[PDB]
A paper describes a structure:
In this study, we characterized a novel (−)-pulegone reductase from Nepeta tenuifolia (NtPR), which can catalyze (−)-pulegone to (+)-menthone and (−)-isomenthone through our RNA-seq, bioinformatic analysis in combination with in vitro enzyme activity assay, and determined the structure of (+)-pulegone reductase from M. piperita (MpPR) by using X-ray crystallography, molecular modeling and docking, site-directed mutagenesis, molecular dynamics simulations, and biochemical analysis. We identified and validated the critical residues in the crystal structure of MpPR involved in the binding of the substrate pulegone. We also further identified that residues Leu56, Val282, and Val284 determine the stereoselectivity of the substrate pulegone, and mainly contributes to the product stereoselectivity. We uncovered the key residues in the pulegone binding pockets of NtPR and MpPR, and illustrated that the hydrophobic interactions and potential steric hindrances may mainly contribute to their stereoselectivity toward substrates and products. This study not only deepens our understanding on the substrate and product selectivity of alkene reductases, but also provides a structural and mechanistic basis for the engineering and directed evolution of pulegone reductases, enabling the production of enantiomerically pure end-product in industry.
Pulegone reductase is the key enzyme in the biosynthesis of menthol and is required for the stereoselective reduction of the Δ2,8 double bond of pulegone to produce the major intermediate menthone, thus determining the stereochemistry of menthol. Pulegone reductase is a double bond reductase (DBR) which belongs to the NADPH-dependent, medium-chain dehydrogenase/reductase (MDR) superfamily. In Mentha piperita, (−)-menthone is directly synthesized from (+)-pulegone through the reduction of C2–C8 alkene double bond catalyzed by (+)-pulegone reductase (EC number 1.3.1.81). It has been reported that the reduction reaction proceeds through stereoselective transfer of a hydride from NADPH to the carbon of the substrate.
Residue numbers in the entry:
A (entry chain A), B (entry chain A): 1 to 62, 64 to 68, 71 to 341
C-alpha cells in the first residue's frame, strides 16, 4: 500500500569492494500487519549503523551469515507503526539488530529489541554509544579483558565506531591507553578529543613493532583488536605476561584474499596470553548496567562521541565503501527519513 | 667432596638441533650444605623429565628463560641428602621444577616442591602422571577449556607426555575425543591402549583440513594444542561456536625458523573462539584435587600411562633429540642413579 526502497547485495565480498555489489530496488509493503500474524511489529526505520562488522557478515564463511539478492539487515532505529506484540504500540521507538536497509521493515519475531526511553539524547546515539557500538566496547573491555587498575591498554582503529569508546572507558577506568588510526586528522583528533594518553598513525610508521615499544616500554596488558593482520603480530611480541586480547574485528583481511599470516603464535605460551573472539549479542543481558554507568558521564561532558551522518537511503552504498577503505571518521550512520 | 656430572647447553636452539649443543661436564660438589645457608636442601637427583616444553625454554625469547653455558634445570625426582629447611630431612623424596641435569643439586630456595607420599607407585610417575605432565593435562583441560558433558575434544601429539592424559581425562569426563600422532605404531597404540574414540596419523593425510571433518562432521569444541602451525589453522576452520583452544605447546615451530603462518584468525570472531596459552606452574594450588581424583583410577586399571626410559646421565642428549624430532614414544624420562 506504500512503496518501500530496499538495499540488497550482489555478491559475496571476498575482496576489492565495488559499489555495483549493492542493488538499490523499490518494493511494495502494506502499511499494516496482515491477518494471522501475532507477535510482530511493522516499523519505519530511521537511522542505520554502518560499522566494520557488516563487512564480516559478507564473508562467505559457514550461521547468522548475511550474504547476494537477500535484503541487508543490521542495527537501526525504527518507529513502531503497527503491532501485534503487546510490548509495542504505534509511535514507540526502538533499536535492535532486526532493522532492514529499507524504509519500512516487518519484524516478525523481535527478541533483542530495546525500548528508547528517549529523554533528550539525540536519536542517533541509540545507534552509536547507547546501541551496539557502545555495548560492544563495554562488553569487549570489562568482560573479556578483565581490566585491573593501572594496566597498559591499546586500541586499534580508535577512530572507528568501537575504538573511540574503548579508550575513553579505559582511562576513566584508571589505565594507560594508546590509540592507532589511519590519518593525521584522526590522530590529533584522537589525542585532543578523547584524552588518549597518546596516539599515532599506523601507516606513518612503516614498522609496527618499532612503534609499539616507542609508546609501550613497559609492555602491553590489554589489546582491543579491530584490525588483526601483522599488527596483531606486533602486539603479541610486546604483550606482558598474562595479557589478554579481545578480538572484535579484523579489518586488514576484508581488503584482499590470502590474508596476512601471524607467525608468533608461539609467544602465547611463555607469556600466557588469552585471546578471545567475541560478538556483542552474547552480552546483551548487561546493557542495563552499561546504560546506568554511561548515564551520568554524558551531560557532565565526561565522555564524548562523533559521527559521519550521510542522509538518505541511496547513499548507504557510498557510505559503506567509506568504512571499507577507511575514509570515514567516527561512526558511519545513514538516515532514511526525518 | 664428591664429583657431580652436569649437562649444559651450547647455543640457543632456533632450529636444526645438533647434539653438539649439549656439553657434558664433570664438576665438584660438597656432600653437605655450606655454613650460613639456611632454608636450603642438597638433593641427589634420580629421574628427570624430557618433555617438549624444555625446547621452548631454549627459544631466545624475552623471563624464566632457560638458555648457553648455564646448567639445564627442569623437573625431576630427588632425594634430600642434607637440609637447612625444616620441611625436609635426609632420605626424603620430592619432585619439582628445581632439579638440575646433574647427579647432585643444591636447591637454595625451594618453593613448588611436593612431598613424595610414596606408597607403592613407581617412582618415575611423579615425573609423569603425578608430576608436571599430568598436572599440565589436568590444568589445560578442566580449567582452561571449561569442558561440558558430551562435547567434541581433539588432542594433538596424543602420544606425548601430556596428550595421552588429556584424552583419557576427557572421555572419562564424558566427551567424544580424537587423537593425532606421528607413526602407525602410535596411532593403534593410541587406539588400543587409551580407548580413544578414534585416532589417525597426521602425515598419512597430506591435507589436515580434509582429515578433520573425516573425524568431526559435527565440528570441534575443545582443542588441546601441542603442535600449532597449520594444524592449528585447520582446527580453527572446524571449531564449533564458543569453542576453546588450550595452547600447551607449538612443536611444529621448534624445527625451523620462519614458523608457519596462521591466516584464518578472522574465524575467531564469528564463532567466538577462546584461545589461551598457559603453563602448568600457575595452576599448582589445584594439585591436591588433581591427585585425589587420579588416586582411585590408577589401581582399578581405569587409566594408564607409558614411558621411554633411558638410563644414565650421559644419554640425556640423545634422549632430547628423540622428542625434538618425534622419535620418542610416551614420556621421555632419564635415570641418573638407581
Amino acid at each position: 500500500m506504500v512503496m518501500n526502497k530496499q538495499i540488497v547485495l550482489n555478491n559475496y565480498i571476498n575482496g576489492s569492494l565495488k559499489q555495483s555489489d549493492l542493488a538499490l530496488r523499490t518494493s511494495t509493503i502494506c502499511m499494516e500487519i496482515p491477518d494471522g500474524c501475532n507477535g510482530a511489529i511493522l516499523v519505519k526505520n530511521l537511522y542505520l549503523s554502518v560499522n566494520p562488522y557488516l563487512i564480516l557478515r559478507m564473508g562467505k564463511l559457514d550461521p547468522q551469515f548475511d550474504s547476494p539478492g537477500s535484503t541487508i539487515v543490521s542495527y537501526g532505529v525504527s518507529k513502531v507503526l503497527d503491532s501485534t506484540h503487546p510490548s509495542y504500540e504505534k509511535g514507540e521507538l526502538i533499536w535492535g539488530s532486526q532493522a532492514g536497509w529499507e524504509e519500512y521493515t516487518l519484524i516478525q519475531n523481535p527478541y533483542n529489541l530495546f525500548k528508547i526511553q528517549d529523554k533528550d539524547v539525540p536519536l542517533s546515539y541509540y545507534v552509536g554509544i547507547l546501541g551496539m557500538p557502545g555495548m560492544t566496547a563495554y562488553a569487549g573491555f570489562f568482560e573479556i579483558c578483565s581490566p585491573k587498575k593501572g594496566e597498559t591498554v591499546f586500541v586499534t582503529a580508535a577512530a572507528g565506531s568501537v575504538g573511540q569508546l574503548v579508550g575513553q572507558f579505559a582511562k576513566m577506568f584508571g589505565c594507560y591507553v594508546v590509540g592507532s588510526a589511519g590519518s593525521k586528522e584522526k590522530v590529533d583528533l584522537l589525542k585532543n578529543k578523547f584524552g588518549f594518553d597518546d596516539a599515532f598513525n599506523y601507516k606513518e610508521e612503516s614498522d609496527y613493532d618499532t612503534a609499539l615499544k616507542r609508546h609501550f616500554p613497559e609492555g602491553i596488558d590489554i589489546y582491543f583488536d579491530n584490525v588483526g593482520g601483522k599488527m596483531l603480530e606486533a602486539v603479541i611480541n610486546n604483550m606482558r605476561v598474562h595479557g589478554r586480547i579481545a578480538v572484535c574485528g579484523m579489518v586488514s583481511q576484508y581488503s584482499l584474499k590470502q590474508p596476512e599470516g601471524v607467525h608468533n603464535l608461539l609467544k602465547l605460551i611463555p607469556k600466557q596470553i588469552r585471546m578471545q573472539g567475541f560478538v556483542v549479542v552474547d552480552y546483551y543481558h548487561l546493557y542495563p548496567k552499561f546504560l546506568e554507568m554511561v548515564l551520568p558521564r554524558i551531560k557532565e561532558g565526561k565522555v564524548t562521541y562523533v559521527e559521519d551522518i550521510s542522509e538518505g537511503l541511496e547513499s548507504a552504498p557510498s557510505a559503506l565503501l567509506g568504512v571499507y577503505v577507511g575514509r570515514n571518521v567516527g561512526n558511519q550512520v545513514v538516515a532514511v527519513s526525518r
